[PDB]
């Protein structure tokens, strides 16, 4: 052992004193206590040591610094901080969705169709789409909404049976391209 003893004696004086020592008075303090001529390089040790002391520039020092003892060790260098308390994901529970944005153009007729398609693994067949519309939402509404196969093709995959455009089926297409 050697450098560990130099380390431990500077924390010993500074801890015993509690009130730190000015860097200019440190060398004669060291000479008095440990009977040795402090080399100038040990000042550089004092500047870098995280476990022995802290160099401080109190406002009254002006042109020199105080060596406080190691009580200020390990301030925010835990290297385990992400798991010391591991807080929940959001900024706070009141902010569970930091993101913001708006939905797509989906008027009530599109919404009726889109949910209605969602209710059936069978899809809705060309006649069953009107029947299920009127039954489920308890409405009797314009043929402009329930016979306009094109608007239904905006909300649904429309595909045919018995021939091209001979009989029709609807499956969900549920357009929601909006990301913001």
UniProtKB/Swiss-Prot annotation:
Signal peptide: none annotated. Disruption phenotype: Mice develop cataracts and glaucoma and males are sterile. Within 4 weeks of birth, mice develop a posterior cataract that becomes severe with age. At later stages, the lens fiber cell compartment develops vacuoles with lens capsule rupture and extrusion of fiber cell mass into the vitreous. In addition, the mass of fiber cells passes through the pupil into the anterior chamber of the eye. By 4 months of age, iris flattening is detected and anterior chamber depth increased. Residues 75-104 are annotated as: Disordered. Residues 75-86 have a biased composition (Basic and acidic residues). Mainly expressed in testis. Expressed in spermatogonia, spermatocytes and round spermatids (at protein level). Also expressed in the developing lens. It is found in: Cytoplasm. Residues 3-71, 105-174 form the HTH OST-type domain. Component of specific cytoplasmic RNA granules involved in post-transcriptional regulation of specific genes: probably acts by binding to specific mRNAs and regulating their translation. Required for lens transparency during lens development, by regulating translation of genes such as CRYBB3 and HSPB1 in the developing lens. Also required during spermatogenesis. Belongs to the TDRD7 family. Found in a mRNP complex, at least composed of TDRD1, TDRD6, TDRD7 and DDX4. Found in a complex containing CABLES1, CDK16 and CDK17. Interacts with CABLES1, CDK17 and PIWIL1. This is Tudor domain-containing protein 7. The gene is Tdrd7. The chain holds residues 223 to 400 of 1086 of the full protein.
């Amino acid at each position: 052992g050697h450098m560990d003893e130099v380390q431990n004696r500077i924390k010993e004086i500074l801890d015993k004193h509690n009130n730190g020592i000015w860097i200019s008075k440190l060398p004669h303090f060291y000479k008095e206590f440990y009977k040795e001529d402090l080399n100038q390089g040990v000042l550089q040790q004092f500047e870098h040591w995280p476990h022995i002391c802290t160099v401080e520039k109190p406002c009254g020092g002006g042109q020199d610094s105080l060596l406080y003892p190691a009580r200020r060790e390990q301030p925010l260098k835990s290297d385990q901080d992400p798991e010391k308390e591991l807080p929940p994901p959001p900024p706070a529970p009141k902010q569970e969705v930091p993101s913001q944005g708006s939905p797509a153009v989906m008027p009530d007729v599109k919404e009726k169709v889109a949910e209605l398609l969602g209710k059936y693994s069978s899809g809705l067949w060309a006649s069953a789409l009107p029947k299920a519309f009127e039954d489920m939402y308890k409405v009797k509404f314009p043929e402009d909404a329930l016979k306009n196969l094109a608007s239904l093709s905006d909300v649904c995959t429309i595909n045919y049976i018995s021939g091209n455009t001979q009989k029709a089926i609807l499956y969900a297409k549920l357009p929601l391209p909006t990301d913001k």
